Amino acid sequence: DSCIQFTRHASDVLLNLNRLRSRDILTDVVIVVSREQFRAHKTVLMACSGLFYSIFTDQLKCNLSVINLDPEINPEGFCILLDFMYTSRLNLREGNIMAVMATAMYLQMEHVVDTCRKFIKASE
Amino acid sequence: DSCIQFTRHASDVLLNLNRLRSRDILTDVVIVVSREQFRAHKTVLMACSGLFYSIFTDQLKCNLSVINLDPEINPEGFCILLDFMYTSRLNLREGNIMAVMATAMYLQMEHVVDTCRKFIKASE
C-alpha cells in the first residue's frame, strides 16, 4: 500500500496496556500459580504465549475467569514472564534463569526459551 | 534494572492482536459509525484513543457492548484509524485526509492529528 507508519506506535500501545494492568482496568482473567494470583488481559496473554493462545481459542475455556497452571510452575518465573509480556523487558538473573526457562517452555514463548538457552550455554 | 529487551516484542504483540481482530477472537465491543459496525478489543481502543480511554474507564460505560459515535463521523475515516490502531500504518490519501483528521481529533489521537496537520500544511 501507500501507508505511512508511526515507528513508536506498537511500543506506546504496549506501555498503555501495562498502565491498564497496573490500574487493574479491564483485566478479565486471574492466573493462579500455586498460592499466587495474577490478573491480566486474556488478549495480551494470547498474543504472547502459545499456551494461552490455545486456552482462550478453546470454546469452553475462553469463558473461564480463573486459570490454574501446573503446580510445578514457579510463581516468580511466571511473574517475570508476565512483566516481559507487558514490557518487552526480561529480568533474567543467574538465580532465576532455570525457573524462567522452564516457565517459558510451558507457556510456549519461543523467543524467551531461545535467550535462556544462549545464556545457559555461555555459563557452561 | 538489569533487564534485557526483545526489540521486536511490541510489534509482534500488535501483529497478533490484529490477527485476533481479523479472526473475531475475544472482540468485546461493537463501534457503530452511522450504518457501519466495527468489532474491536476495548483494551486496544483505550490504549490508542483518549476518547475510548475516557469511555471505558467510566463505571457505567465500561459495561456496554455497543458504542454509537457522533453521526458526523465518517465510517471510512474511522476504518482507517482502526486499522492504524492495530497496525501502526496509516492509509492517508488526498481524498481521505480531511475525514481522517476530523475523526482523529474526535478520537483524541494526537500523533495522527499532528501528521495530518503537517501534510495539509505542505499542500497549501
Partner: peptide
C-alpha cells in the same frame, strides 16, 4: 512517521 516513516515510509515502511
Amino acid at each position: 512517521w516513516v515510509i515502511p
